[PDB]
Write a protein that binds this ligand. Structure first.
Ligand SMILES: OC[C@H]1O[C@@H](O[C@H]2[C@H](O)[C@@H](O)[C@H](O)O[C@@H]2CO)[C@H](O)[C@@H](O)[C@H]1O
Ligand SMILES: OC[C@H]1O[C@@H](O[C@H]2[C@H](O)[C@@H](O)[C@H](O)O[C@@H]2CO)[C@H](O)[C@@H](O)[C@H]1O
Ligand SMILES: [Ca+2]
Ligand SMILES: [Ca+2]
Ligand SMILES: [Mn+2]
Ligand SMILES: [Mn+2]
Lengths: 240, 239
């Protein structure tokens, strides 16, 4: 069996196991600010940032046909400071081709480049979407399972608890092909779930980079924070 | 679209929407005690109790082939008072033939009668198992998805936070045939998940009863509480 795992109880500046891209920075306090926080302490619009684990993950093997099961957990907080304009745009956990650089921002969350479901993306992602674009369901925010497209194969509306910490658990079982995501707000006790069938060997390349990405809006003050406090990941590829 | 739903923020003695069976009692305080609590305040062993919603649920229609999606949520607490003997046996959310009575207790949790996987059970259940029987994985407690058998098709170990309230969410999506269960302990923030493919059309009858069941052990003091504080359910059958 081939396994890989990491766990950051808090983010460590300078720890090379993580790569920061775009606007992403890690504070001395250990918080990953995916999108820029201005000097005044407020979230900047037109910002896109990501972080990738620096070691590629072997998600499946074409020769043996084996597929890995994996799990990832993280705690994040989104703070929407203004009543108007509408906040944006969201944050997301993604898995895709190695050596990737940030893609388009805004509604594409730094992961996609359009609203097409293109197999060439070879990307799987679980989004926490705060702005309703033309391809989105009207309810925001919502959790979404994205398979080679920003247009989610399934969505689940959830109520934001402004500025509070949400705990996320995402798990993929290769035998059942079930991808599940759960969001819990300790503050209110709210629990949300979403799941769908995803055959990773039909979507992802054999080796992938895993990461987190966040993006704020296309107009002044159409923004919110996209802070992450912790992040763990584990994958196991059976020999079979 | 045929829908049904209910929500008990707490339980009230006498409410006809719930049928109590076996040892099950609803306290004046609004707590559903699935298994007997002795007058000394401790859980009694050799106890089995359940509750069934008095309304029948239309889970699927053979004529149209339509299948319902559903979700249930409940809060419970299991308190294991002694270091020995080992605590037992657990509690479970189950769906199956209407107007049923309590099955075997102990490890069968008041839902099954043996450890065989018999289509005749026509029962789907999500267990919160506290005692490792011969047909069980070694670690306890564990969540388990049971399809016509107490020998779950999928299990997930979880740490008990003794006497604390656990929040459970069980959801079935008919389109994907995914049955998922989540357990969260607000006290510690711990989150556990389990999911598996279940084609309810192959397991359950068209109309089913939904309920909760709990059981304590076969030897003196091999027991624990099986208290439920709230329970909600919702199902929707397209067509
Ligand atoms: O407002 C946040 C929202 O902006 C969308 O882009 C808008 C832009 O803000 C508006 O000024 C312009 O007139 O139209 C654009 C749409 O074509 C983003 O697309 C959306 O993702 C959010 O970022
Ligand atoms: O001890 C709790 C445990 O008991 C099992 O039954 C035992 C019984 O307790 C023991 O005294 C007897 O000698 O053997 C029985 C089984 O081999 C139950 O089966 C189990 O579910 C728990 O309730
Ligand atoms: Ca969006
Ligand atoms: Ca057992
Ligand atoms: Mn979306
Ligand atoms: Mn079991």
């Amino acid at each position: 069996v081939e396994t890989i795992s990491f766990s950051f109880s808090e983010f460590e500046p300078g720890n090379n196991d993580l790569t920061l891209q775009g606007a992403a920075i890690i504070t001395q306090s250990g918080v990953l600010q995916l999108t820029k926080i201005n000097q005044n302490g407020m979230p900047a619009w037109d910002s896109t940032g990501r972080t990738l684990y620096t070691k590629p993950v072997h998600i499946w093997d074409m020769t043996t046909g084996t597929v890995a099961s994996f799990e990832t957990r993280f705690s994040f907080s989104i703070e929407q400071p203004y009543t108007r304009p509408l906040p944006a745009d969201g944050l997301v956990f993604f898995m895709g081709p190695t050596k990737s650089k940030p893609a388009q921002g805004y509604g594409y969350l730094g992961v996609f480049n359009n609203s097409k479901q293109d197999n060439s993306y070879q990307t799987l992602a679980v989004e926490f979407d705060t702005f309703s674009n033309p391809w989105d369901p009207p309810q925001v925010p919502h959790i979404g399972i994205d398979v080679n497209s920003i247009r989610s194969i399934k969505t689940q509306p959830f109520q934001l608890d402004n500025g509070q910490v949400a705990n996320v658990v995402i798990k993929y079982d290769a035998s059942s092909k079930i991808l599940l995501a759960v969001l819990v707000y300790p503050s209110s006790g709210a629990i949300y779930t979403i799941a769908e069938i995803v055959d990773v060997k039909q979507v992802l390349p054999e080796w992938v980079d895993v990461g987190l990405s966040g993006a704020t809006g296309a107009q002044r003050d159409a923004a919110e924070t996209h802070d992450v406090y912790s992040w763990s990941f584990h994958a196991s590829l059976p020999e079979t």
